[PDB]
């Protein structure tokens, strides 16, 4: 199956309260494996998964040096962007960066990403061609023209097409038993009377991996998407995820509604009925 | 591995 690696960067300015706070996390598929915080104590890249601890101290020294380098880069970018937008010198602002590569079942480069943001809005983004940039506002074109003259697209493509996929494949083999496994959902249904005339049927999905899951109610085959309460897929804290779905029912029509669980860990889609 | 090209923004 198609696997992924993606790093997330967050740099928040603290005007007068210190230096910008840099938080960095790395996610192979849906499993975090590295972490760095500038306001921490270790001041080092730290593992967050068992299959990455097997890497040598050299890995944990080069990753610490390289991830710290982006903290310095975003520090100056924070003031550069403040001037572009003419914001106050005492206000806090956030720069967010997402980049990563995608391999296929074979292990070959499928596609790569690079997206930057400012204050929760898009700023600049590397296109799919890995050769051109897309700016969102007129101040991001300042960055684009600078980055187009520095051939940043070439340099970023050299990582996404090279070092990225190389180490993603390495990470996948280091944790075969944890990354290339699928945990099917543990499904059950519950029934809560709202009154003596109505009730709430909830369809549950517990401890499943990965995150992608589709839960749908049907009334004699007709979808009930309009009359349904859906919650965001949420983590359990142990690497698996949770999701439950509710529908309000008449008193004596609980056996007309069916829940359908779709997940790649299930060889055949489940059908739950009360 | 980390490979974000920083070029000034």
């Amino acid at each position: 199956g198609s696997h992924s690696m993606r790093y997330f960067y967050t740099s928040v300015s603290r005007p007068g309260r210190g230096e910008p706070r840099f938080i960095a996390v790395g996610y192979v598929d849906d499993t975090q494996f590295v972490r760095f915080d500038s306001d921490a104590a270790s001041q080092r890249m730290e593992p967050r998964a068992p299959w990455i601890e097997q890497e040598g101290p050299e890995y944990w020294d080069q990753e610490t040096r390289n991830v710290k380098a982006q903290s310095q880069t975003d520090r100056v970018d924070l003031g550069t962007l403040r001037g572009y937008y003419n914001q106050s010198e005492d206000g806090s602002h956030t720069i967010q960066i997402m980049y990563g590569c995608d391999v296929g079942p074979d292990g070959r480069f499928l596609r790569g990403y690079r997206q930057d943001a400012y204050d929760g809005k898009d700023y600049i983004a590397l296109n799919e061609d890995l050769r051109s940039w897309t700016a969102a506002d007129m101040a991001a074109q300042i960055t684009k023209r600078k980055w187009e003259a520095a051939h940043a697209a070439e340099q970023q493509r050299a990582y996404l097409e090279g070092r990225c996929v190389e180490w993603l494949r390495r990470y996948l083999e280091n944790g075969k038993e944890t990354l290339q496994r699928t945990d099917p959902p543990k499904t059950h249904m519950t029934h809560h009377p709202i009154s003596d005339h109505e009730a709430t049927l909830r369809c549950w999905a517990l401890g499943f991996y990965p995150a992608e899951i589709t839960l749908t109610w049907q009334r004699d085959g007709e979808d009930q998407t309009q009359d349904t309460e859906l919650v965001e897929t949420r983590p359990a804290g142990d690497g698996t995820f949770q999701k439950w779905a509710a529908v309000v029912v008449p008193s004596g029509e609980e056996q007309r509604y069916t829940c359908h669980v779709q997940h790649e860990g299930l060889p055949k889609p489940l059908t739950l009925r009360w | 591995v980390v490979g974000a090209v920083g070029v000034g923004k």
Partner: antibody
């Protein structure tokens, strides 16, 4: 010395072709460079390559085979303004550059 | 528009003296490096910096000191000069790989006894 350049000295006639080679011993190298230093001057980038294949810009042609970690500079139509030290570079497992000894081009007028 | 300057440009010193070589970039580059070129070794990294205030060691950092007081200035301090520190010293600036490392004019230091 991880980066090995050959030849050490090259006397090429004016108008001829000069092929310089460089090979790395560090397998974790994703980018290669070629820098030109005229006598008593500073190094300045000439070519860059990170993908397998060839890249032509003017009289200069650069080649790369990441399997053998081999880069090759081919200066055609040699002019006396190319007599310089040619340095090969390679991106580390870090993001620093590993520099080579250098090759001396002498273009006899 | 690359502007990497170096000062001093030529200097004679005595064994035991202090030689502080300075470099100045105006290209908003967070990475600055201090190289040294001798015959048979090419360019060899002494010290380098990833940003203002930071100073990291390179491959030949013994006998040399460094200081990055600002993003624009990077210094190489030879506290106790030795005759083995006679070389041509180059300072470079760049941006974390980084299409090009922009080199300075280079300083000719000859340490005599």
């Amino acid at each position: 010395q991880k980066v090995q350049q050959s030849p050490e000295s090259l006397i090429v006639p004016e108008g001829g072709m000069a092929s310089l080679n460089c090979t790395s011993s560090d397998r974790n190298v994703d980018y290669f460079w070629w820098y030109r230093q005229h006598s008593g001057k500073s190094p300045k980038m000439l070519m860059s390559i990170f993908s397998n294949g060839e890249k032509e810009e003017g009289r200069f042609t650069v080649h790369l085979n990441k399997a053998s970690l081999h880069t090759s500079l081919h200066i055609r139509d040699s002019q006396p303004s190319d007599s310089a030290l040619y340095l090969c570079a390679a991106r580390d497992s870090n993001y620093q550059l590993i520099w080579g000894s250098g090759t001396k081009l002498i273009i006899k007028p | 528009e690359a502007a990497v300057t170096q000062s001093p440009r030529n200097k004679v010193a005595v064994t035991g003296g202090k030689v502080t070589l300075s470099c100045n970039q105006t290209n908003n580059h967070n990475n600055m490096y201090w190289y040294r070129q001798d015959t048979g070794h090419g360019l060899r990294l002494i010290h380098y910096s990833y940003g203002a205030g930071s100073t990291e060691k390179g491959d030949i950092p013994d006998g040399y000191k460094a200081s990055r007081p600002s993003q624009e200035n990077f210094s190489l301090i030879l506290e106790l000069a030795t005759p083995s520190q006679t070389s041509v010293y180059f300072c470079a600036s760049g941006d974390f790989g980084g299409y090009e490392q922009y080199f300075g004019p280079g300083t000719r230091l000859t340490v005599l006894e």
